[PDB]
């Protein structure tokens, strides 16, 4: 079912792949329906976050010499207070994609599975119980209807702002 850990962990990996970019462009390309509305709404918010230059200046100033340490330190800081919300989950996905775009690797195709693994690892160990309390990944979909694209963007950017300003 939608609240089973198998399904929650399955839909989440499909979201990461469709959201996390490994390049800046798109030329040449790379060659469920409720899942599709999530994949697209994540994209719309990603480009809205990408166009907040206050956020980008602070993201660019983040050290990435140790990508693993940076990821787990930042993800843990986002969920340490125990008051989870969907905006923080979006901020987790976005920060994961920014790491992929700013951390070198002679086999970047491996660094992307590695960073995707870190996010799913953190999701399983820390968020899986809360996500099924929310009816599954449908909670994120219904969360995008409780506000406009700016209400979510400003909030998600503030989550990232608080977690990148200390760690």
């Amino acid at each position: 079912g939608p609240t089973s850990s198998e399904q929650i962990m399955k839909t989440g990996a499909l979201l990461l792949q469709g959201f996390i970019q490994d390049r800046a462009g798109r030329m040449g390309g790379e060659a469920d329906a409720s899942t599709k509305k999530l994949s697209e709404s994540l994209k719309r918010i990603g480009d809205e976050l990408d166009s907040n230059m206050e956020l980008q200046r602070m993201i660019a100033a983040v050290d990435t010499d140790s990508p693993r340490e940076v990821f787990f330190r930042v993800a843990a800081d986002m969920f340490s207070d125990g008051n989870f919300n969907w905006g923080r989950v979006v901020a987790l996905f976005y920060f994961a994609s920014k790491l992929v775009l700013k951390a070198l690797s002679t086999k970047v195709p491996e660094l992307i599975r590695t960073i995707m693994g870190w996010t799913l690892d953190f999701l399983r160990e820390r968020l899986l119980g809360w996500i099924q309390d929310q009816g599954g990944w449908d909670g994120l979909l219904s969360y995008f209807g409780t506000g406009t694209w700016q209400t979510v963007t400003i909030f998600v950017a503030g989550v990232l702002t608080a977690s990148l300003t200390i760690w």
Partner: antibody, heavy 118, light 107 residues
């Protein structure tokens, strides 16, 4: 202005290699993909591949896999292409070109004419 | 790979003519088709991207249209500096350039 300054013309013997550089300036180097293009009479314009300087990711045309190797150095804002196992069929003009954002090949390098002959 | 058939290969026109160049794709490439202009000894220059968008600085007399498989670049009134070679480029699946169209002036 965005500027893409490419290295000097090349005269190489067959079977050797050559490394062409593309010096970028006027923008944040790690926010744009950089492509390479081959122009030659008959073959025309062919896409070789691109590289994203932000993390070093690359994608290659199947016809140029093994032939070309795309690299970039963040701190120098320079892109490199290494052409291997040179033959007469590789005598051509090679361009680096930047892929824009919401826009395609807007800024080009001037081209580097590579001449392979014995 | 996707094949691009460009036509005509050679086009004779006069200053002030409405000129049309055609490009056909062996497979639907959606909107991801550009047109480039090249003069002698120079890199190509973006004239039209995404079937019909004009880069900043490109004169309005250039316009483009398409369907996914059939595409057309149009010069509404040819001027002298438009005498060049023109190429189409699909970037939907891989990247493929057309063979080119050489535009000359009549006399």
């Amino acid at each position: 202005q965005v500027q893409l300054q490419q290295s000097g013309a090349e005269l190489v013997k067959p079977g050797s290699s050559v490394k062409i550089s593309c010096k970028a300036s006027g923008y944040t180097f790690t926010n744009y993909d950089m492509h390479w293009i081959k122009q030659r009479p008959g073959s025309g314009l062919e896409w070789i591949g691109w590289i994203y300087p932000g993390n070093g990711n690359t994608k290659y045309n199947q016809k140029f896999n093994g032939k070309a190797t795309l690299t970039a150095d963040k701190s120098s804002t320079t892109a490199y292409m290494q052409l291997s196992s040179l033959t007469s069929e590789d005598s051509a003009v090679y361009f680096c070109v930047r892929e824009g954002l919401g826009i395609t090949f807007e800024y080009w390098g001037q081209g580097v004419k590579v001449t392979v002959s014995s | 790979d996707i094949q691009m058939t460009q036509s005509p290969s050679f086009l004779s026109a006069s200053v002030g003519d409405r000129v049309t160049i055609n490009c056909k794709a062996s497979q639907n490439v959606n909107k991801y088709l550009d047109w480039y202009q090249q003069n002698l000894g120079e890199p190509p220059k973006l004239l039209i991207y995404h079937t019909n968008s004009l880069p900043t600085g490109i004169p309005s007399r250039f316009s483009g249209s398409g369907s996914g498989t059939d595409f057309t670049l149009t010069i509404s009134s040819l001027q002298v500096e438009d005498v060049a070679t023109y190429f189409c480029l699909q970037h939907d699946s891989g990247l493929t350039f057309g063979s080119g169209t050489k535009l000359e002036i009549k006399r």
